[PDB]
């Protein structure tokens, strides 16, 4: 399956959750007892990985929250044209479906490709939507 359930108390920091059908990454967790007799409630503060928005939800601790599958994958650039990166996989597979980043990451990547470094791109998959998060340079195998 694309996504799998988990418990709120089983969740911990720097883990992925589904909040309002968005892949989110937790920055804050806090548990407070509801009433003296009652079970504690978990208040979760998380950041969407793709959009960067801050989303929070509180739930019972025993409640089950949905968790996405996030895969980070490593590729080499071939060209940046029309806002669409062209990447090259190990064993020689090529994809052009990735859109170029639109922020300061995209600006730095564009300048780095213009001045000619060999750039290593990390793109993540979660719940059927695809994006690029970071780039490095290959220190060896020039």
């Amino acid at each position: 399956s694309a996504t799998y359930p988990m418990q709120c108390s089983a969740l911990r920091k720097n883990g992925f959750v589904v909040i309002k059908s968005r892949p989110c990454k937790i920055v804050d967790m806090s548990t407070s007892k509801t009433g003296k007799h009652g079970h504690a409630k978990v208040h979760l503060v998380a950041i969407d990985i793709f959009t960067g928005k801050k989303l929070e939800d509180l739930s019972p601790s025993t409640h089950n929250m949905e968790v996405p599958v996030v895969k980070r994958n490593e590729y080499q650039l071939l060209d940046i044209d029309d806002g669409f990166l062209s990447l090259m996989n190990m064993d020689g597979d090529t994809k052009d479906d990735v859109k170029a980043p639109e922020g300061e990451l995209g600006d730095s990547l564009q300048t780095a490709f213009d001045e000619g470094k060999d750039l290593m791109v990390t793109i993540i998959s979660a719940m059927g939507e695809e994006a690029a998060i970071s780039f490095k340079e290959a220190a060896r195998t020039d």
Partner: protein, 56 residues
């Protein structure tokens, strides 16, 4: 005026802003803060052109 969701706005101006003059119009949009949004949208267009110029 033939793009989506514009006639819904145009009904309200006929409903409540028919009897108005431009001094009051500028005062109310400055007091409601939409003019700053229009300014920042045109500014974002300006850095959209400007970043291409700096790249060249």
């Amino acid at each position: 005026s033939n793009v989506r969701g514009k006639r819904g706005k145009l009904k309200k101006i006929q409903k409540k802003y028919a009897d108005q003059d431009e001094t009051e119009r500028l005062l109310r949009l400055e007091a409601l803060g939409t003019l700053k949004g229009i300014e920042k949208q045109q500014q974002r267009k300006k850095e959209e052109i400007m970043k291409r110029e700096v790249r060249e």
